[PDB]
Design an enzyme around this catalytic site. Structure first.
Site, PDB file in Angstrom:
ATOM      1  N   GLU A 183       0.762  -1.296  -0.029  1.00  0.00           N
ATOM      2  CA  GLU A 183      -0.018   0.068   0.065  1.00  0.00           C
ATOM      3  C   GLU A 183       0.705   1.302   0.249  1.00  0.00           C
ATOM      4  OE1 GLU A 183      -1.650  -1.449   3.748  1.00  0.00           O
ATOM      5  OE2 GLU A 183      -3.632  -1.605   2.521  1.00  0.00           O
ATOM      6  N   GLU A 377     -11.113  -3.803  -1.595  1.00  0.00           N
ATOM      7  CA  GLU A 377     -10.967  -5.020  -0.749  1.00  0.00           C
ATOM      8  C   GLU A 377     -11.497  -4.632   0.581  1.00  0.00           C
ATOM      9  OE1 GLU A 377      -6.584  -5.337  -0.579  1.00  0.00           O
ATOM     10  OE2 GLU A 377      -6.469  -5.852  -2.614  1.00  0.00           O
ATOM     11  N   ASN A 378     -11.825  -6.083   1.304  1.00  0.00           N
ATOM     12  CA  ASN A 378     -12.171  -6.145   2.482  1.00  0.00           C
ATOM     13  C   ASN A 378     -11.021  -6.047   3.368  1.00  0.00           C
ATOM     14  OD1 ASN A 378     -12.010  -8.979   1.222  1.00  0.00           O
ATOM     15  ND2 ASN A 378     -12.169  -9.621   3.438  1.00  0.00           N
TER      16      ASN A 378
HETATM   17  O1  LIG Z   1      -2.087 -10.491  -0.664  1.00  0.00           O
HETATM   18  C1  LIG Z   1      -2.072  -8.835  -0.673  1.00  0.00           C
HETATM   19  C2  LIG Z   1      -1.721  -8.435   0.547  1.00  0.00           C
HETATM   20  O2  LIG Z   1      -2.337  -8.931   1.779  1.00  0.00           O
HETATM   21  C3  LIG Z   1      -1.987  -8.256   3.081  1.00  0.00           C
HETATM   22  O3  LIG Z   1      -2.045  -7.005   3.230  1.00  0.00           O
HETATM   23  C4  LIG Z   1      -3.590  -6.528   3.017  1.00  0.00           C
HETATM   24  C5  LIG Z   1      -3.903  -6.180   4.438  1.00  0.00           C
HETATM   25  O4  LIG Z   1      -4.313  -7.515   5.072  1.00  0.00           O
HETATM   26  C6  LIG Z   1      -5.500  -5.672   4.395  1.00  0.00           C
HETATM   27  O5  LIG Z   1      -5.775  -5.283   5.695  1.00  0.00           O
HETATM   28  C7  LIG Z   1      -5.448  -4.287   3.616  1.00  0.00           C
HETATM   29  O6  LIG Z   1      -6.611  -3.821   3.505  1.00  0.00           O
HETATM   30  O7  LIG Z   1      -4.918  -4.439   2.442  1.00  0.00           O
HETATM   31  C8  LIG Z   1      -3.533  -5.154   2.155  1.00  0.00           C
HETATM   32  C9  LIG Z   1      -3.249  -5.467   0.644  1.00  0.00           C
HETATM   33  O8  LIG Z   1      -4.073  -5.913   0.051  1.00  0.00           O
HETATM   34  C10 LIG Z   1      -0.312  -8.687   3.230  1.00  0.00           C
HETATM   35  O9  LIG Z   1       0.038  -8.008   4.376  1.00  0.00           O
HETATM   36  C11 LIG Z   1       0.179  -8.103   2.197  1.00  0.00           C
HETATM   37  O10 LIG Z   1       1.665  -8.293   2.306  1.00  0.00           O
HETATM   38  C12 LIG Z   1      -0.125  -8.347   0.535  1.00  0.00           C
HETATM   39  O11 LIG Z   1       0.387  -8.255  -0.146  1.00  0.00           O
END
Ligand SMILES: OC[C@H]1O[C@H](O[C@H]2[C@H](O)[C@@H](O)[C@H](O)O[C@@H]2CO)[C@H](O)[C@@H](O)[C@@H]1O
Ligand SMILES: OC[C@H]1O[C@H](O)[C@H](O)[C@@H](O)[C@@H]1O
Length: 492
Positions: A183, A377-378
């Site tokens: 992010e 995304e959730n």
């Molecule tokens: O696999 C995608 C990523 O998933 C996690 O990060 C999420 C996080 O859990 C969620 O709360 C937030 O809203 O979005 C992020 C990004 O999708 C992992 O921690 C990441 O390392 C992954 O890239």
């Protein structure tokens, strides 16, 4: 059905973390296949996966191994699903849900041993090794390359080595990782350093590069004596306990405002500059670009918005900290992927002053106001109808338009995350209803062109937008009106 199809919002599902292990091995293709086939039967449009930098370029600079991922993409294609590929330039392991440890390339970490300042650093001096600080974006200290060049070369290599999958339309979008958890944000709430929700978090601009950047900036502003925040407290503090975030505190002083503007601007430029490289790398490919913005809902309900501020989103009740991001994305024709689509304020503890519903409304509204596509995304694992209904509501805030396309609709939603739990009888049955409602009661539609999601060659980035113009988007605007509940609930 015709008019209903124009209301279709695609649904994607995130693959399990570690599908390709740290040794660059596609561990369980047979197991994954069975799961993907269930998703295909359930009507899911595609899946999302992290293409881990620490896995691919592990051997050394420009020594990429795309073999295991080619096998993964091949399987996804065989299962009739599209793919959202994340250029994951971050570490997996220290954030919520990370059940596997995947650090960034060891050769980069080796450099970090001699130069601790390539990592985001807090006031206490703790180095966070999950992502390279924006401070070194253009510092040629990685065996001659800058961090941005590393990201650029990676994406170009991905584009060429996956050329066949790209040409066939397997990959619908490239999610450009821009920081922790992919992010565009600072690692202000590191579980690895003891942070616990709803701590206000901490500013992460103390590495020598950012600090020097700041000092030069304040000097040009006529205040060379200004120092980085020294009264913002610690990770698990509440706003009122700090001199920076308390009422009439430092955040509203000329010094505080200058710092917050500088701090947040670093992220805007970071995203803009790397997306420049993404447009170059994927120029002409039938894919869309997207970035991820974290949903920092805690403290959204207090005037200081402390957590958003330490995260790098300079968002206040009288300053829109997200629309500038949306405006920045417009020149790249990029998608703003926002989280928390599943949350309701009532589900958060009162002491967190949490406003996920309002935050989502603000971010999505800003994106549409800037005429860009907004997906999401959730934030946390959810298998309940309440969560799905909230996601569906955010997907089409004003409901379905039986007379044509809805005025407002998200461009897609990616569900976190594929797991054994999701596939269980009841959970999966509810999920299938979620997919159905997201699809506006229509059967799965293989050709995106039918619901106006045609895939066209990625065009060059539009001209650069001056920071002044980007910041004009900080002007508060009224959000689009939201229905109190979706007109397409998974049940009744
Ligand atoms: O696999 C995608 C990523 O998933 C996690 O990060 C999420 C996080 O859990 C969620 O709360 C937030 O809203 O979005 C992020 C990004 O999708 C992992 O921690 C990441 O390392 C992954 O890239
Ligand atoms: O660890 C970060 C997470 O903390 C809490 O679970 C919040 O509710 C969630 O929105 C956030 O992403």
């Amino acid at each position: 059905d015709s008019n209903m199809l124009l209301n279709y919002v695609p649904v994607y599902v995130m693959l399990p973390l570690g599908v390709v292990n740290v040794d660059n091995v596609f561990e369980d293709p047979d197991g994954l296949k069975e799961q993907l086939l269930q998703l295909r039967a359930a009507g899911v449009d595609g899946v999302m996966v992290d293409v881990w930098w620490g896995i691919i370029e592990l051997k050394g600079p420009k020594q990429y191994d795309w073999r295991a991922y080619r096998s993964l993409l091949q399987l996804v294609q065989e299962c009739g699903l599209t793919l959202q590929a994340i250029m994951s330039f971050h570490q997996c392991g220290g954030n919520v849900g990370d059940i596997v440890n995947i650090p960034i390339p060891q050769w980069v970490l080796d450099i970090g041993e001699s130069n601790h300042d390539i990592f985001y650093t807090n006031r206490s001096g703790t180095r966070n090794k999950e992502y390279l600080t924006v401070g070194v974006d253009n510092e040629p200290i990685f065996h001659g390359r800058t961090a941005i060049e590393i990201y650029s070369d990676y994406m170009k290599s991905f584009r060429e080595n996956m050329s066949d999958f790209l040409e066939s339309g397997l990959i619908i979008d490239i999610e450009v990782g821009l920081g922790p958890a992919g992010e565009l944000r600072y690692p202000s709430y590191p579980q690895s350093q003891g942070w616990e929700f709803p701590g206000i978090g901490e500013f992460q601009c103390y590495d020598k590069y950012l600090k020097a950047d700041f000092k030069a900036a304040v000097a040009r502003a006529g205040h060379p004596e200004w120092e980085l925040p020294d009264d913002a407290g610690k990770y698990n503090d509440v706003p009122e306990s700090t001199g920076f975030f308390k009422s009439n505190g430092t955040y509203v002083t000329e010094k505080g405002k200058f710092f917050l503007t500088w701090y947040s601007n670093k992220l805007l430029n970071h995203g803009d500059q790397i997306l420049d490289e993404a447009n170059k790398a994927f120029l002409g490919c039938k894919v869309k670009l997207a970035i991820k913005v974290s949903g920092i809902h805690w403290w959204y309900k207090v005037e200081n918005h402390a957590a958003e501020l330490t995260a790098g989103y300079y968002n206040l009740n009288d300053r829109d900290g997200y629309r500038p991001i949306a405006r920045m994305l417009s020149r790249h024709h990029a998608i703003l992927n926002f989280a928390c689509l599943e949350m309701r304020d009532s589900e958060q503890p009162s002491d967190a002053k949490s406003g996920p519903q309002e935050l989502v409304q603000q971010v999505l509204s800003g994106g549409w106001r800037e005429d860009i596509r907004v997906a999401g995304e959730n934030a946390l694992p959810r298998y309940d109808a309440t969560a799905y209904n909230q996601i569906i509501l955010n997907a089409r805030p004003q409901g379905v338009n039986n007379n044509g396309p809805p005025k407002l609709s998200m461009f897609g939603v990616t569900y976190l995350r594929l797991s054994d739990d999701l596939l269980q009888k009841s959970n999966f049955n509810i999920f299938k209803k979620f997919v159905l409602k997201m699809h506006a009661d229509q059967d799965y539609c293989a050709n995106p062109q039918k619901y106006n999601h045609a895939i066209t060659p990625l065009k060059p980035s539009a001209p650069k937008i001056p920071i002044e113009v980007l910041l004009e988007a900080t002007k508060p605007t009224l959000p689009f009106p939201w229905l109190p509940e979706t007109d397409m609930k998974v049940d009744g």
